[PDB]
């Protein structure tokens, strides 16, 4: 094989295909890219046998058939470490990858492309499109709530589901939960899949406000995202993922509406005021009043009050500072509404202004 093209139409592609991967791969084949040329198109392919990115580049200058597997780290630095504007001529020499940037020519050790483990294709089962930014926010709004290394492996990934003409993701470590729903623009059937950590990360990556409204195809045990030239694909996690509806507080009496940043303060302040961080925050809601004090079990120190809109009995509930703060941050709003019940049962924070997203945080042992 042989092809030649600028250092621009290559670095970007060569950066996205090997972007997620990169390290001390297992077998040498896993840390290698797949270079192919045919019909006047060079196709780069990277994979970690969980997901795989594939860039498509139409070879303008002289091209020629062939399939080789050159290393990734190496092959990228080289082209990335050359005169910006220089052309690169690659040709498969029996068992080496001859490169040429002017006369700055290299030679890479290469394994057969007949050994590459490309996610042997499978059958698509839904598909639809929707602006990146939308498919973006859906992630941002729930990503922080996905477990990290939980033995309940299904939690280590976000869920995606479509029903109606609404796409909604939901993440959860079994202490706090996050949910966001968005309008795609197409009436789609109803299916629900679990995209994993890395996969969500990658999917989040490629997204960047590009004139290529992401196209999505959910399926058997795979899901892919064709965004212009890049085509990210991830396998799915399998297991019963908790029902976001069975956790939402059921008929909560107590309701309160405060200030998004005013509460950030409250909690943030009390957070620092808490020298023994494992004790968490202590909220005391009383008829239109919020005395938020850093829970110091064996102590009574300084706290803060807030002039909020409350209803229901008075109660003091414990809260893991963080869980509450992530929620307030995710809610880039002004006024936050809340729904309580019990000092030992789930709470539902959420923006007042809208209902696109909703969070639920389990209080902590006071």
Measured between alpha carbons, how far is 5 from 22 in angstroms, rounded to an integer?
24
Which lies closer to other proteins via its Cβ, residue 208 or residue 276? 276
Does 242 bind other proteins (CB under 8 A)? Our answer is yes
Beta partners for 222?
Answer: 219, 235
Measured between alpha carbons, how far is 198 from 354 in angstroms, rounded to an integer?
30
Does 318 bind other proteins (CB under 8 A)? Our answer is yes
**Looking at 176, 224, 226, 254, which residue binds other proteins (CB under 8 A)?**
176
Q: Is 200 helix (H, G, I), strand (E, B) or coil?
A: helix
Ligand-binding annotation for 323, yes or no, is: no
Does 364 bind other proteins (CB under 8 A)? Our answer is yes
Beta strands in 122-273 (DSSP E): 128-129, 157-172, 176-196, 215-219, 222-227, 230-235, 255-259
Ligand-binding annotation for 149, yes or no, is: yes
Pick from 81, 83, 65: nearest CA to 14: 81
Q: Is 194 helix (H, G, I), strand (E, B) or coil?
A: strand
- Exposure on the CB side of residue 194, measured as CA atoms within 13 A: 19
Ligand-binding annotation for 24, yes or no, is: yes
* Minimal distance, residue 24 CB to other proteins, in Å: 13
Distances (CA, A) of 72 to 16, 25, 52, 202, 246: 11, 10, 13, 17, 46
Does 177 bind other proteins (CB under 8 A)? Our answer is yes
Which lies closer to other proteins via its Cβ, residue 103 or residue 246? 246
CB atoms within 10 A of CB 354: 10
| 63 and 102 Cβ atoms separated by less than 8 Å | no
Beta partners for 38?
Answer: 41
Residue 247 CB contacts under 8 Å (≥ 6 apart), including other chains: 177, 346, 360
**Looking at 29, 89, 273, 362, which residue binds other proteins (CB under 8 A)?**
362
Rounded to 5°, angle at Cα 225 from 219 and 230? 140
**Looking at 62, 83, 112, 174, which residue binds other proteins (CB under 8 A)?**
174
How many residues touch other proteins under the rule CB under 8 A: the total is 24
Q: Per-residue x/- marks for other proteins, 250-289, CB under 8 A?
A: ---------------------------xxxx---------
Question: Site residues for other proteins, window 154-173 (CB under 8 A)?
Answer: 172-173
Measured between alpha carbons, how far is 247 from 120 in angstroms, rounded to an integer?
38
Q: Which stretch binds other proteins (CB under 8 A): 84-92, 145-153, 196-204, 224-232?
A: 145-153
Which lies closer to other proteins via its Cβ, residue 162 or residue 341? 341
**Looking at 56, 136, 175, 291, which residue binds other proteins (CB under 8 A)?**
175
Does 247 bind other proteins (CB under 8 A)? Our answer is yes
Q: Which stretch binds other proteins (CB under 8 A): 92-100, 217-225, 285-293, 356-364?
A: 356-364
Instruction: State the binding site for DNA.
Output: 24, 73, 149, 153-154
Instruction: State the binding site.
Output: 24, 73, 149, 153-154
Would you tell me which residues interact with other proteins (CB under 8 A)?
A: 150-152, 172-177, 242, 247, 277-280, 318, 320, 344, 346, 360, 362-365
């Amino acid at each position: 094989m042989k092809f030649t093209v600028e250092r621009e139409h290559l670095l970007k592609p060569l950066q996205q295909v090997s972007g997620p991967l990169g390290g001390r791969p297992t077998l040498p084949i896993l840390g290698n890219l797949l270079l192919q040329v045919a019909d006047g198109t060079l196709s780069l392919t990277g994979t970690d046998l969980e997901m795989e990115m594939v860039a498509r580049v139409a070879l303008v200058q002289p091209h020629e058939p062939g399939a080789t597997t050159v290393p990734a780290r190496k092959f990228f630095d080289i082209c990335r470490g050359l005169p910006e504007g220089a052309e690169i001529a690659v040709q498969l020499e029996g068992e080496r990858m001859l490169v040429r940037s002017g006369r700055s020519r290299f030679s890479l050790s290469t394994l057969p492309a007949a050994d590459f483990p490309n996610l042997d294709d499978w059958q698509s089962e839904v598909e639809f499109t929707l602006p990146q930014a939308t498919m973006k926010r859906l992630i941002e709004a729930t990503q922080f709530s996905m477990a990290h290394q939980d033995v309940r492996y299904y939690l280590n990934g976000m869920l995606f589901e479509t029903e109606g003409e609404e796409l909604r993701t939901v993440a959860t470590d079994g202490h706090r939960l996050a949910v966001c729903s968005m309008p795609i623009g197409q009436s789609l059937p109803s299916h629900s899949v679990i995209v994993p950590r890395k996969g969500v990360i990658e999917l989040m990556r490629m997204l960047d406000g590009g004139d290529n409204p992401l196209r999505v195809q959910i399926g058997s045990n795979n899901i892919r995202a064709h965004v212009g030239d890049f085509i990210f694909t991830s396998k799915l996690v399998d297991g019963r993922f908790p029902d976001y509806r069975r956790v939402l507080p059921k008929n909560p009496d107590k309701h309160l509406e405060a200030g998004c940043d005013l509460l950030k303060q409250a909690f943030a302040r009390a957070a620092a005021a808490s020298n023994e961080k494992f004790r968490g925050v202590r909220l005391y809601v009383s008829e239109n009043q919020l005395k938020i004090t850093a829970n110091n079990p064996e102590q009574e120190e300084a706290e803060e009050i807030l002039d909020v809109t409350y209803s229901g009995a008075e109660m003091e509930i414990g809260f893991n500072v963080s869980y509450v703060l992530d929620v307030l941050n995710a809610l880039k709003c002004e006024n936050v509404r809340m729904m309580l019940t019990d000092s030992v049962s789930s709470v539902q924070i959420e923006d007042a202004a809208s209902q696109s997203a909703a969070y639920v945080v389990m209080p902590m042992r006071l």
